[PDB]
Amino acid sequence: MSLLSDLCNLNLSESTEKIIAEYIWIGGSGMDLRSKARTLNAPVSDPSKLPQWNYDGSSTGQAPGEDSEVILYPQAIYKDPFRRGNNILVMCDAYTPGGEPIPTNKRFDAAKIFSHPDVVAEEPWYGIEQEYTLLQKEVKWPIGWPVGGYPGPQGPYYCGIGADKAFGRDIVDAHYKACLYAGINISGINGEVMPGQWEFQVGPSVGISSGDQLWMARYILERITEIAGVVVSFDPKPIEGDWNGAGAHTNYSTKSMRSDGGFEVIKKAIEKLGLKHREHIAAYGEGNERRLTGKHETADINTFLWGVANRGASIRVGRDTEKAGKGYFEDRRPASNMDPYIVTSMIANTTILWKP
Amino acid sequence: MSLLSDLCNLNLSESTEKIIAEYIWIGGSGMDLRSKARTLNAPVSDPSKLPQWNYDGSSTGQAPGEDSEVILYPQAIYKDPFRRGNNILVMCDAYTPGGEPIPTNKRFDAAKIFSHPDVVAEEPWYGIEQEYTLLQKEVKWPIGWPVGGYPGPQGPYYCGIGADKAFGRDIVDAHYKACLYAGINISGINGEVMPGQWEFQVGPSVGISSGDQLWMARYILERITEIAGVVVSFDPKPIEGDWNGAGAHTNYSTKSMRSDGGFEVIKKAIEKLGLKHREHIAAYGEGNERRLTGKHETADINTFLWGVANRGASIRVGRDTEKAGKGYFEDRRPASNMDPYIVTSMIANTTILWKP
Amino acid sequence: MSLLSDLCNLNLSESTEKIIAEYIWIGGSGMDLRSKARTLNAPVSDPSKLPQWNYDGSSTGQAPGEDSEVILYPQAIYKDPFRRGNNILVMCDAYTPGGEPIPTNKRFDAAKIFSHPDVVAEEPWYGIEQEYTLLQKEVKWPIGWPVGGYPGPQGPYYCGIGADKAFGRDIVDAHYKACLYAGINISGINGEVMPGQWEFQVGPSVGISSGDQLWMARYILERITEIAGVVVSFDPKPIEGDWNGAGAHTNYSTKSMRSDGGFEVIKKAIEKLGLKHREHIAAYGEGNERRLTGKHETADINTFLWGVANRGASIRVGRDTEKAGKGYFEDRRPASNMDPYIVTSMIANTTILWKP
Amino acid sequence: MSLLSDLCNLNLSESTEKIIAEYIWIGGSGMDLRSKARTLNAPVSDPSKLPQWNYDGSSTGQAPGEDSEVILYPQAIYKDPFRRGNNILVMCDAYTPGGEPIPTNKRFDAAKIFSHPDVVAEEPWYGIEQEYTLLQKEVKWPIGWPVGGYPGPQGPYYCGIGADKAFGRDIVDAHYKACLYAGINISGINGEVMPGQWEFQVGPSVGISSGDQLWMARYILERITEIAGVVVSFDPKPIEGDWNGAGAHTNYSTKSMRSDGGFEVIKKAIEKLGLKHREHIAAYGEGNERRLTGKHETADINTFLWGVANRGASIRVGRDTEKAGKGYFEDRRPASNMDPYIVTSMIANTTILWKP
Amino acid sequence: MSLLSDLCNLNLSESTEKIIAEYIWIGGSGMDLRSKARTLNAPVSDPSKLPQWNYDGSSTGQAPGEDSEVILYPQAIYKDPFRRGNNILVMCDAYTPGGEPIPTNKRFDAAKIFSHPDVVAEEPWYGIEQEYTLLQKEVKWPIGWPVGGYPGPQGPYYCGIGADKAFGRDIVDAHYKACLYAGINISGINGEVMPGQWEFQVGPSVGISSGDQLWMARYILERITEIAGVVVSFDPKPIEGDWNGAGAHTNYSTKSMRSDGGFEVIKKAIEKLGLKHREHIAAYGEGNERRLTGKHETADINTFLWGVANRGASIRVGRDTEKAGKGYFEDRRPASNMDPYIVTSMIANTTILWKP
């Protein structure tokens, strides 16, 4: 189209020297994201030089009814894909005046854990595999499904090509381009054994940058999906039928594990993480009850078991690590609406800081 | 349109230096193709430097067993038409951990038979004439045909121009441009006697590059018709009533045939191929019995006829070849869903290595 | 639409040196045109340095059922408007193995008669005024025309501007641009009395080349209207009723007539044309029985007339020719589906060779 | 619908005794019909008492320039299916002012022929089998034909049954019941091989009654299909190609042919009919040339063939009729757009008055 | 609408005592029917009193080339549900001119078998159940069937109620009432597991009457669904996949089995049926092998299984029947496209005449 499309893609440095910095903060329910733009004066490149901002804490649902002002802090800056130029995107944190973070921040303790000398001397690496569903505008069925109906049986959809196999690859391709342009270290994408569903894998990020990049990628996906004209649901089981349930896996790797002869280290880490499976399964995301039932390459909710090749194992280890004696292992417990901060912090703490 | 079309065509070489590389492997049923992308780090030009992957063996219906990982070996690299820049497309063949090919690979034997000193001394040339149908998204009739109805009788459609003659020349022209840009040695296109059917002829490739290029061209066509929202079927008889049945032909040549007085060579090779007619029929296509019936310039399923201008002959030789004493002969047996690897290997073996 | 529009418009000179030469030959019924593309290795500029193709002579209906191969010879090369670059369009004439022109060739005798020393010493000039109707895709009424209805009385449409007067000036303007770009020596366009109808004038093309010019212009028009989405019919009476009938006229000129004392020469030529009239009126086109009736500025089938100003005269002379000699005369006998080769050949032959 | 039906079927006899009479006369073309109604004070039963009434002949193209008045002579009385009650349908003949028939009357001569003492003393019987095609309102395709296409080949369409096999049998049933009600001798109905073409047999009414009843049945049919919203065309070849046409089988038999052993009289009658085949065909109606070629169980216009059980013969005699030695025979040559008056009158003239 | 239906339900007997005879005969395929109508002069009740009539067998594809005439023999008189009054539907058998039956008759042999003194002295009754699917008119999916998809898994569809559970039950109910009215012994109806599939039990009629009534019920059903704009296919497996198909259960019981100690007699009859089951399967109908694979409550083609409460056996005997020691048994092996004449006559033959 050409209506309103000339003004949106208008060069910024031609006239003035002003950029705009959209502000992103975690919403009230813990999963929704909110954003509101604000002009700047000079193109900034240091996240510590940005000015703090605020929003109404009683409209979203993060503050009581006596004092709604919620001070925000800027954390990271990423290049704006939807308006290019020198515009930036920032990730912010919700705090109350007086320096106390809101109960629904989840990044204060994450940064506290990851500022420890041990973790900064170990620098763990995390790779997250996110799975999301694309739903229609109104009916709220996945796109491509007939209204009140279902497509053919699953199996000829995984990494499919052509029509009737991939529904809406434009959104995912645009997402890939935008995250490669912004600065997020994305790795690759593929289909999933459910039609409409997809998946993108975030690369080996260090520290809390994993959570930062995952959140920014979720924001980019939501904006691109809004541009297209559909909605995205991150819940673990979008459809209650007999289809794949969305989830997430977390690659784990520290310096000692991938240095030399790390098989014993990964093994001991498996027992360490299995010791406290209770709180870990309780703190990986609401809605995991309908995902982990015993079907569709999933384990059971109240059991812990690990293997080397079985796809039903809650935690598995790549056979390449066994070949070489060093590598990683896959944590297949987290659901598709998890908070990367808490999961990453719990894994790092239970692995490197806990002394039984 | 401008809905996300600006983001898809974004030059990634201006900001970053990384490229992406889609992976293509032969599916489970033998005809389906699957793809999933990844991000490399440097623009590669040697196929031997690429890293290997795997995929879910129990999702494509070729699971070796408990260990579902299916290692993939990159073979050839082609420039990406749908993303331009330094993006590439690669062709991969399936394998199992342990160095053995998957049962539905059919490329291991082809490579091991085309690495023979004799065949590399003779360097056969193959020209493949693939013909496909374009059929609608929903009712599965060919595009242009009325729903539950038929257009005028065949005859005014062959190489037709204008509306009511060519149904979707845009898609085929885009395919031709993309194949010429990628690196495939495509020769030309033309219509066939049916509304919707078409044809593209692949040029004189050498060795297993014939199968590589044919498979990559099929992938490119399928992606393009996915962009256009149309499904493509390669089966020999898309419509069973009266119309022309799709198939394929295989030009063949070696050094002796096109250099010396090779009329005797080509004729004796024709009897050689006629001696092994049984498994050659059995190994050209699933569903070929609906094509070869005795009508529409097709041979029968129980005879082997070769001549000079017999339109129904299973094999014919070029008249310029006979007049000049050197050239090629045309194999009209293969169907439209063939595997180029097996047909190429069988022809080469039966004509240069197999002896009475 | 931005779908598939990026791939179609690509600059192949950026990556390779290959071009695309599309072959055009006169079909079986005499009026249909057929095409199929190929890939030349290097750009060419001499029409005598091209390879010869063939096609299935039994599919079109132009060759017998024994040896369907139909050798084609390239004649002229024109720049491709629909893909630009170094791509070319070639005009080809059919034949049979053995060098014998097909019964429906009609260009062999044209070239033979125009290679005569007298003709090449006289260099006749022909200007052709072709008029065509644009029909809808399905109903087969003209465009901008109610189904089962009529727009209104004629008179406000001739050279009309604005809506309700010109139905599809976009297609004709595109045709004008493409013909000026290709190499055709087109002169001008205008509307015609009945709505939907149009007219373009090919102007002063010397020698046999007039047939090539007009045929390539027809091909360009038909491809352009295929792109638009409507069909075009060249029959003399597209719609039966009280409406203007389509046709054609042929300007004629030779060195003697446009030299000093040319009025006597043109009068002698008109008398000669009147003397040999039966085969002329039987060879100008199939469909004159509905055009030449006696109405709408048209002569009668059973008469021959000449004049300077009468609109119903079968032939006439331009006024400036009468005033100041030189000039030409307009042959108003040919219909709208004529073969230019035979018409120009007989006109030149009757003018310069036959004696009473 | 709910309204415009209560007062369209309202009963008038309950209030008064005024009836409605529709006067029917043939237009100038000779293939369509005209009708207009006139109130009568009291109900009538015999056509003799109905007074004559005039109509404008200028618009019908049957009147001289000065005096444009035409007089009608009521002939037959039939009841009205669209008004019920005592309302009547009456057939009329156009007469010049002065006691002479209109040139396009075609019934005065028939009445003179049939009123001859020998003709009435022979009591002829006539049976006609007319066929028609139901076609749409705008696109002029037959009902059920996919627009811009053709349905399946000949097959389950000749007197077929079921959805997608027989189109619009409700109109045929409506005609059958209405013509049984009105007073028209209808024998039976059955579909035709072309999808959308039907047929109804008119009973063995005697003399001028056969023509009168057939004209009235055609009037009722075209009124019914006007009500339904479908145009009916009785042309012998509504659709040209590989589909059957429409004809009439005028079965002839007088008192002698069904009383004694007329097995040797039927052949004499056939020969008498065939003595003047040329003008006999010429007196049948336009469109006869495109149907009689030999295919679709038809005969040849320029040859006279007679047989026993061959559909290729112009005249055919049933096996039971020839076995019994008495009965009738089938006259297949008359066209479906004939004038029944002329056909029956001239057949009677040939049979009883004309001599070899 | 109100019009075009008032005169489709008129009282023809009000004016004249003419009745309408609907002649019915099987086409050449053996799975569809044909219809023809004619006016009789007086109402009849005895089928033998109805005169013979002929149809053109060339289009039917079951007539000799020289003599296309085919003679019909009325068999059974059933009252009309679409015209009411005294109008009748009659089932007819096609006879060649000469006495010998049509090759595709299947009724003369059945009549000879059933007219044998032993068969009529045993007075068998047959119970036949048939199942069918209600397909759409353009896309060949069932009714209520989400296009481009499938409905929920097999759930509340077997004789279910409510919207979105039972589709198009109005057609089935109208068929039930119409078959009760016409004179066909129909027992009951219920839904089927596949959404849109139904069935109706035909009551225990005698011998040839069972086949005649089944044919007439199929005729009436297809007429009704033609009125409703829905096509009906009695295929053994209309849709391939994880959905149930359609079959035919024949309930056979003669005097001996129904009386006294019939358990041993029915067991002996079952063994007699199983002795030569190969031609039994061969003489039921095409498409049986797709339906008979083992799943969806059926036996295997190559294996003969019998039992009492096992649905996997080709023969099932009710618990009450065996408890009482007398009754019938169910033959699940017939296909949904069977010929009732052949099945009934063959069952009677193998029961009473054919010996081991």
Using CB atoms within 10 Å of the CB of residue E31, give its burial: 0 to 12 exposed, 13 to 18 middle, 19+ buried: middle
Burial class (CB in 10 A: 0-12, 13-18, 19+), D297: middle
Q: List the beta strands (DSSP E) in chain E.
A: 19-26, 33-40, 53-56, 69-79, 88-95, 125-135, 186-191, 197-206, 231-233, 248-253, 306-307, 315-316, 329-331
- Rounded Cα distance between D134 and B276, Å, is 58
Pairwise CA distance, residues B334 & B314, whole Å = 10
Kindly report the backbone phi and psi dihedral angles of residue A51, in degrees, each rounded to the nearest multiple of 5, phi listed first.
-90, 145
**Residues of chain D neighbouring E15 (CB-CB closer than 8 A):** 79, 181, 183
Token pair of E91 as six digits: 């089932």
According to DSSP, residue E317 is labeled -
Considering only alpha carbons, which residue of chain C is nearest residue D137? C148
- Are A91 and A215 spatial neighbours (Cβ–Cβ below 8 Å)? yes
Contact between C132 and C245 (Cβ < 8 Å): no
Q: For helices D263-274 and D340-352, give the axis angle rounded to 10 degrees.
A: 120
CB atoms within 10 A of CB D291: 22
B150, B167, B240, B242: best mutation site toward chain D, by most D Cβ within 10 Å?
B150
Tokens of A167: 């529904």
Q: Report chain B's C-alpha Rg in angstroms.
A: 21
C-alpha span between D247 and D284 (Å, rounded): 11
Task: Tell me the three state secondary structure of residue C67.
Answer: coil
- Is the distance from CB of B38 to CB of B53 less than 8 angstroms? yes
CA A158 to chain centroid: 22
The three-state secondary structure class of D280 is helix
8 Å CB contact between D199 and D190: yes
Question: In D197-339, which residue ranges form alpha helices assigned H by DSSP?
Answer: 208-228, 263-274, 277-282, 319-324
- Find all residues with CB under 8 Å of A193, minimum gap 6, and list them: A154, A155, A157, A158, A244, B56, B59
Query: Is E42 within 8 Å of E109 (Cβ atoms)?
Result: no
3-state secondary structure of E206: strand
Burial class from Cβ neighbours inside 10 Å (0-12, 13-18, 19+) for residue E262 reads buried
Nearest to C234 by CA among C81, C94, C32, C89: C32
Residues linked to residue B331 through DSSP beta bridges, in sequence order = B250, B315
> Residue D331: phi, psi to the nearest 5?
-115, 95
Cβ of D149 within 8 Å of Cβ of B153? The answer is no
The pair of structure tokens assigned to D221 is 């049919």
The rounded distance, in Å, linking the Cα atoms of C156 and C170 is 19
Burial class, C204, CB count within 10 angstroms (exposed 0-12 / middle 13-18 / buried 19+): middle
CA dist C182 and C185 (Å) reads 9
Contact residues for C161 (Cβ-Cβ < 8 A; gap 6+)? none
> According to the 3-state scheme, what is the secondary structure of E91-128?
EEEEECCCCCECCCCCCHHHHHHHCCHHHHHHCCEEEE
Q: Report d(CA D176, CA D189) in Å as an integer.
A: 8
Q: What is d(CA C49, CA C38) in angstroms, rounded to the nearest whole number? A: 15
CA B279 to chain centre: 21
- Do E221 and E132 meet the contact criterion of CB atoms below 8 Å apart? yes
The secondary structure of B75-130 as a DSSP string is EEEEE-TTT-TT-EEEEEEE-BTTTBPPTT--SHHHHHHHTSHHHHHH--EEEEEE
The shortest CB-CB distance from C148 to any of D138, D147, D148 is to: D138
Give the C-alpha separation, C349 to C346, whole Å: 5
Choose the mutation target among A79, A82, A161 for the interface with B, i.e. most B CBs under 10 Å: A161
What tokens does A309 get? 């090749």
- Cβ E5 vs Cβ E227: under 8 Å: no
d(CA D330, CA A170): 70
**Which residue bears the tokens 């002949």?**
D57
Tokens encoding B318: 């070029």
Q: Are D and A neighbours with ≥3 CB pairs closer than 8 A?
A: no
What's the gap in Å between the CA of C198 and the closest CA on chain B? 18
Closest CA to B184 of C86, C15, C87: C15
Contacts of C139 in chain D (CB under 8 A): 138-139
The angle formed by the CA atoms of residues D294, D300 and D303, to the nearest 5 degrees, is 140
Look up residue C296 and give its two tokens.
Answer: 């709408």
Measured CA to CA, the distance from residue E76 to residue C223 in angstroms comes to 64
| E and A interact (at least 3 Cβ pairs within 8 A) | yes
- What amino acid is encoded at B85 in this protein? G
Distance CA A199, CA A217 (A): 12
Angle in degrees, 0-180, between the axes of helices D169-182 and D208-228, rounded to the nearest 10: 140
Q: How far is Cα E335 from Cα E283, in angstroms, rounded to an integer?
A: 10
Residue A104 burial by CB count (10 A; 0-12/13-18/19+): exposed, middle or buried?
A: middle
DSSP states of C188-240 as a string? EEEE-SSTT-EEEE---EETTHHHHHHHHHHHHHHHHHHHHT-EEE--S-SS-
CA distance C57 to A348: 76
Of D150, D241, D242, the CB nearest to B149: D150
Residues of E in contact with D217 (CB under 8 A): none
Radius of gyration of chain D (CA): 21
Taking the C-alpha atoms of residue C120 and residue C131, their distance in angstroms, rounded to an integer, is 29
Searching chain E, which residue's CA lies closest to the CA of residue D312? Answer: E66
* CA of B134 vs chain C CAs: smallest distance (Å): 16
Q: Which chain D residues touch E231 with a CB distance below 8 Å?
A: 162-164
Which token pair is B84? 């331009």
Residues in chain D within 8 Å Cβ distance of C148: 137-138
Among the partner residues D1, D2, D190, nearest to E36 by beta-carbon distance: D190
Measured in angstroms, the CA of B194 and the nearest CA of chain D are apart by: 14
| Euclidean distance between CA atoms D181 and E8, whole angstroms | 11
Q: Which helix (H) or strand (E) holds B23?
A: strand B21-26
Using the CB atoms, write b or e for D238-261: b if 16+ within 10 Å.
Answer: bbeeebbbbbbbbbbbbeebbeee
Q: Strand pairing partners for D302?
A: none
Choose the mutation target among D145, D150, D164 for the interface with B, i.e. most B CBs under 10 Å.
D150
From edge to edge, which strands make up the β-sheet containing D129-135?
D231-233, D129-135, D197-202, D186-191, E33-40, E19-26, E88-95, E69-79, E53-56
Sequential DSSP letters for B139-160: S-PBTTSPTT-B-SPSSS-TT-
3-state secondary structure D297-334: CCCCCCCCCEECCCCCCCEECCHHHHHHCCCCEEECCC
Task: Please tell me the distance from the alpha carbon of residue B8 to that of residue D55, in angstroms, as a whole number.
Answer: 75
Smallest Cα distance from B83 to chain A, Å: 10
The Cα diameter of chain B in Å comes to 65
- Enter the tokens of residue E324: 């009482």
Closest residue, chain B, to C57 (C-alpha): B158
Q: What would the two tokens of residue C300 be?
A: 């009668």
- Which candidate from A146, A152, A153 shows the least CB-CB separation from E146? A146
Q: How far is C107 from chain B (nearest CA, A)?
A: 21
* Contact (CB, 8 A) for D77 and D179: no
CA distances from C324 to B214, B227, C260, C263 (A): 69, 64, 10, 9
Query: How many residues in total does chain A contain?
Result: 356
- HSE-up (13 A, CA, CB side) for residue E6: 15
The set of chains that have 3 or more CB pairs under 8 A with D is B, C, E
DSSP string, A97-119: TTSPBPTT--SHHHHHHHTSHHH
Contact D163 E230 (CB under 8 A): yes
Residue E35: which of E222, E267, E281 has the closest Cα? E222
The answer to whether A192 touches A142, Cβ cutoff 8 Å, is no
Instruction: Please measure the distance between the N-terminal and C-terminal CA atoms of chain B and give it in whole angstroms.
Output: 63
| CA quadruple B141, B147, B152, B155: dihedral, nearest 10 | -10
| DSSP codes joined into one string, C74-112 | EEEEEE-TTT-TT-EEEEEEE--TTTPPPTT--SHHHHH
- Six-digit token string for A144: 């491509």
C67 near C58, Cβ under 8 Å? Answer: no
C115 CB burial (10 A radius; 0-12, 13-18, 19+): exposed
Q: Which residues of C touch D229 (CB under 8 A)?
A: none
Q: Are strands A306-307 and A315-317 parallel, antiparallel or unpaired?
A: parallel
Cβ atoms D142, D134 nearer than 8 A = yes
- Contact by Cβ (8 Å): D40, D108: no
Q: What is the rounded CA–CA span in Å between residue E229 and residue D163? A: 6
Separation CA D197–CA D42 (nearest Å): 41
Which residues of D lie closer than 8 Å to C, measured between beta carbons? 137-139, 147-148
DSSP string of C34-48?
Answer: EEE---BSS----TT
Element (H, E) at A306: strand A306-307
Distances (CA, A) of C254 to B45, C267, C313, C329, E140: 64, 13, 22, 11, 68
Phi and psi at C282, nearest 5°, equal -90, -5
| CA C334 to each of CA B223, C29, C344: distance values in angstroms, whole numbers, following the listed order | 50, 19, 11
User: Of B218, B217, B247, B212, which is closest to residue B232 (Cα–Cα)?
Assistant: B218
Using an 8 Å CB-CB cutoff, list chain D residues near E59: 154, 158, 193
Specify whether the backbone of D45 is left (phi greater than 0), alpha (psi in -120 to 50) or beta: alpha
| C207 CB-near residues (< 8 Å, 6+ apart) | C114, C120, C123, C124
Q: Which of E150, E241, E242 sits opposite A149 (nearest CB)?
A: E150
Rounded Cα distance, B124 and B256, in Å: 10
Strand blocks (E) in chain D: 19-26, 33-40, 53-56, 69-79, 88-95, 125-127, 129-135, 186-191, 197-202, 231-233, 251-253, 306-307, 315-316, 330-331
Nearest to D89 by CA among D37, D132, D140: D37
Closest by CA position to D284, among listed D342, D330, D238: D342
Interface contact E152-A150, CB threshold 8 A? yes
Experimental method: cryo-EM
Contact E147 A152 (CB under 8 A): no
B36/A228 CB distance under 8 A: no
Q: Determine whether the interchain pair E149/A153 forms a contact, defined as Cβ–Cβ distance below 8 Å.
A: no
Residue B10 has its nearest CB partner, among A170, A177, A309, at A177
Task: Yes or no: say if C134 and C142 are a contact pair by the CB < 8 Å rule.
Answer: yes
Q: Distance between CA B132 and CA B196 in Å, rounded? A: 9
Residue A93, SS3 per DSSP: strand
Short-list A343, A215, A347, A235, CA closest to A288? A235
Residues on chain E touching B138 (C-beta within 8 angstroms): 139, 147-148
| Residue A69, token pair as written in the block | 């002002």
Q: How far apart are the first and last CA of chain D?
A: 62
Task: Parse chain B into domains and list their residue ranges.
Answer: 1-103, 104-356
